[PDB]
Symmetry: C3
Subunit: 190 residues, 3 copies
């Protein structure tokens, strides 16, 4: 159904750097690292990208993204993250929120090196959007359910010196295409 | 001749949001709405796009783009707009300027809900660019003749609190490819 | 090996304008000019691009890019520049630095009208990255070796009123794909 199972935008603080990477449905697994190969098919390298506003602090952090992470889509649209770098990663995920009994969105999840964790569930997502839309009928919030965000080196949130992800030196925002298609359908039945 | 009959860039105030959408010549009609399907072929959805600088005022306005508009290319490059939302749209068009006896560029045209209006004429455009180039010979101005701009919710101009389109919360700039090809030819005969 | 032998980003001061142009390996020669054809395959036109932050000074300079330059890839990845405009061009190239006995990066090279000069050598590049990486083992610097930058009208550097290229009204940054692939390999053997 989707041409690309996802599209990824990389940011350094509140600036988007480089262009959006679109992962074909033919690449179930995509790696995002600090390397430099621009060929980009099933691997999105952040090391060769320029940013005229880059600071030494951002360059310092980019040094630590190393092997980065692998994003894997299982089935129609279930998503898993595998932390390949030797530095912990920080993920914003509604699925992980629920699985931690944390209030929706009110949590940043630290994924340790070598960790292979599931970060999104399609069906759960579909159920939640229908219920959430239905309750609304009795889109900016609903779309966030189909998006994952990940900071590569600095954690953000309450117990950190950083209030928001846009305050981290290097992060990505992942748009789940199949999830968004379902949301589009839902929105039309409203 | 053109691969894409047009390319569209969406803005929120003076910031371009999302990437440029390119409409294949195979899609004579393209819809631009406030929905969220990212599949984008003959439909450019603005609802799923993020903007780290977005304000509540911009989110309020995006709420009103709804079904948006349809841009249709008739023949080689004649363009028509159909207002699908239940909110009026505001178009900058040299063709509409001439048809309103308004000074070139000195007008913003309000297109009401359900309205199906012609906003660009290829041949007129071709005639005007030749005459205008010829007079110049006796490119920033000439290219504007091949561009349409449209604000989705707020009108701008003299009788409005907004001086320019870049002051509106959500708008698009449409580049007419065939028109630009003709302009390129003209410029080489100068 | 590479799908695109290079990708080019255009800037006006410190703002990237338009999207990145990707040159297929099928187009050994690509022309970058001040014209307006958006078809862009083996020719990247800067004249039809908009920039809401553009100043009259930038428009004045864009007026002088005219026929611009041709970038040619000879063999696997040797690069030559041909100055087609009647205005001199200003290139940042490590290859040209070495050939001028200038300290790496500490030079801006003026290429005069009609000049057809070689600005990059693949093998030299490969040798330098290996040596440079090896010395480091005893990536932001290494990647610059695979990048060419060119200001179209204003020269920058010590003997000019402009300290950096991001201070020029119109310039491009060219990423050499094959060179970057070699660098990626090198980095993995570290």
């Amino acid at each position: 159904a989707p041409e690309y199972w996802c599209s990824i935008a990389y940011f350094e603080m509140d600036v988007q750097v480089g262009e959006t990477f679109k992962v074909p449905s033919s690449c179930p697994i995509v790696t995002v690292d600090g390397y430099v190969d621009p060929s980009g098919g099933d691997r999105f390298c952040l090391g060769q990208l320029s940013n005229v506003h880059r600071t030494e602090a951002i360059e310092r952090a980019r040094l630590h993204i190393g092997k980065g992470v692998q994003l894997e889509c299982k089935g129609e649209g279930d998503v898993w993250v595998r932390c390949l770098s030797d530095h912990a990663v920080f993920v914003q995920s509604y699925y992980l929120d629920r699985e931690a009994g944390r209030a929706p969105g009110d949590a940043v999840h630290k994924i340790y090196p070598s960790a292979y964790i599931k970060v999104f569930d399609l069906r759960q997502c579909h159920r939640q959007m229908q219920q959430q839309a239905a309750t609304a009928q009795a889109v900016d919030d609903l779309r966030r359910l189909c998006i994952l965000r990940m900071s590569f080196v600095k954690g953000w949130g309450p117990d950190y010196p950083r209030q928001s992800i846009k305050e981290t030196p290097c992060w990505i925002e992942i748009h789940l295409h199949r999830a968004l298609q379902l949301l589009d359908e839902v929105l039309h039945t409203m």
